[PDB]
Amino acid sequence: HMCDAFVGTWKLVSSENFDDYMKEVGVGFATRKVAGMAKPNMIISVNGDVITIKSESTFKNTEISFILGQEFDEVTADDRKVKSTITLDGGVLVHVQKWDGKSTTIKRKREDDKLVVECVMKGVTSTRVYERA
Ligand SMILES: Cc1nnc(-c2ccccc2)nc1O
DSSP: OTTGGGOEEEEEEEEESHHHHHHHHTOOHHHHHHHHHOOOEEEEEEETTEEEEEEEOSSOEEEEEEOTTOOEEEEOTTOOEEEEEEEEETTEEEEEEEETTEEEEEEEEEETTEEEEEEEETTEEEEEEEEEO
């Protein structure tokens, strides 16, 4: 029942500061513009110890599967090759991506009927709110 309240299909309903987050990460202009337009669905499922998170959008369809605490290699939607570790901290899924001596953290939390995503790169935070599809 690890992650039960995250499981399901979620749709993006608001975003704040995502262009600035992507700038801080190093995403180039054209990718920022097209990716910033995307309205992804986030599909989260669990099978035993394996969690799968799919993001489907007009921009890209991606999928990661992982075990909490166990590092994996990830190719991000903007084509970074990162080393990722996802843990559960006090009911929050915390996803750290490391590449080129840089690091960013993506937190996913349940708040009321929403799934709130906070993306942080240095001093820049973007907040993305998802609702059940
Ligand atoms: C957590 C999360 N991960 N990926 C995206 C995404 C995917 C494709 C294009 C733009 C953004 N948005 C998020 O909110």
